[PDB]
Amino acid sequence: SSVPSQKTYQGSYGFRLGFLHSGTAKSVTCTYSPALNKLFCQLAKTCPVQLWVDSTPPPGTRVRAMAIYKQSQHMTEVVRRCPHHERCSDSDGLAPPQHLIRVEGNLRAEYLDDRNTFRHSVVVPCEPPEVGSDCTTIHYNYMCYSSCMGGMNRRPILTIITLEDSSGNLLGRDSFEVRVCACPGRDRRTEEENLRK
Ligand SMILES: *c1nc(Cl)c(C#N)nc1CC
Numbered sequence: 653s654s655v656p657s658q659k660t661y662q663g664s665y666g667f668r669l670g671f672l673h674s675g676t677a678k679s680v681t682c683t684y685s686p687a688l689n690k691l692f693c694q695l696a697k698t699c700p701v702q703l704w705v706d707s708t709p710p711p712g713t714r715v716r717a718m719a720i721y722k723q724s725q726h727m728t729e730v731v732r733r734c735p736h737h738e739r740c741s742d743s744d745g746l747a748p749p750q751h752l753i754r755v756e757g758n759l760r761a762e763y764l765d766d767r768n769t770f771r772h773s774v775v776v777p778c779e780p781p782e783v784g785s786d787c788t789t790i791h792y793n794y795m796c797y798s799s800c801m802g803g804m805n806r807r808p809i810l811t812i813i814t815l816e817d818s819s820g821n822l823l824g825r826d827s828f829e830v831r832v833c834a835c836p837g838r839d840r841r842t843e844e845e846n847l848r849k
């Protein structure tokens with residue numbers, strides 16, 4: 653399958669992602685490393701991602717998330733849930749069982765299987781920030797471990813977040829690496845130390 657672009661693109665509205673500061677304690681279920689541009693999270697736990705713009709985009713603007721393999725030799729392979737987790741009875745009534753990435757708590761989420769590339773993606777309407785806030789937050793879930801055999805099989809993935817108009821044309825793009833693992837704080841601390849050394 654052809655490979656979606658991963659080029660960071662702020663666009664006319666100054667679109668970019670943001671992450672909370674969660675730390676590396678034993679209790680953390682989701683933690684973001686700015687040094688690695690990498691999110692570490694437990695299976696099917698809430699991953700809050702902030703969405704920032706300098707200017708308000710038009711009504712009908714949408715936000716899409718899609719995963720690709722990071723390594724060049726695997727980028728053409730569609731990222732999907734492994735044979736075990738795709739058969740889990742963990743449906744929410746909206747997400748197809750094969751999709752790695754879900755949006756939590758948005759009844760207007762739409763899930764696409766692309767007719768030409770076969771890649772999966774989930775898209776929601778882009779909303780203005782709430783009354784007390786300066787950004788919008790979307791909650792994602794990753795429904796397979798990075799280590800799952802017959803799925804990601806220990807290969808790193810990127811999540812690509814695209815801001816789109818009502819036809820799906822590109823308005824902005826950002827991305828981050830993801831590891832889905834049982835000990836996200838410990839793995840973050842280790843991978844950050846490897847980078848320093
Ligand atoms: C999405 N959509 C709108 Cl209208 C706004 C505003 N204001 N912000 C987002 C998140 C990038």
Ligand SMILES: [Zn+2]
Nearest residue numbers: 734737796800
């Ligand atoms: Zn799995």
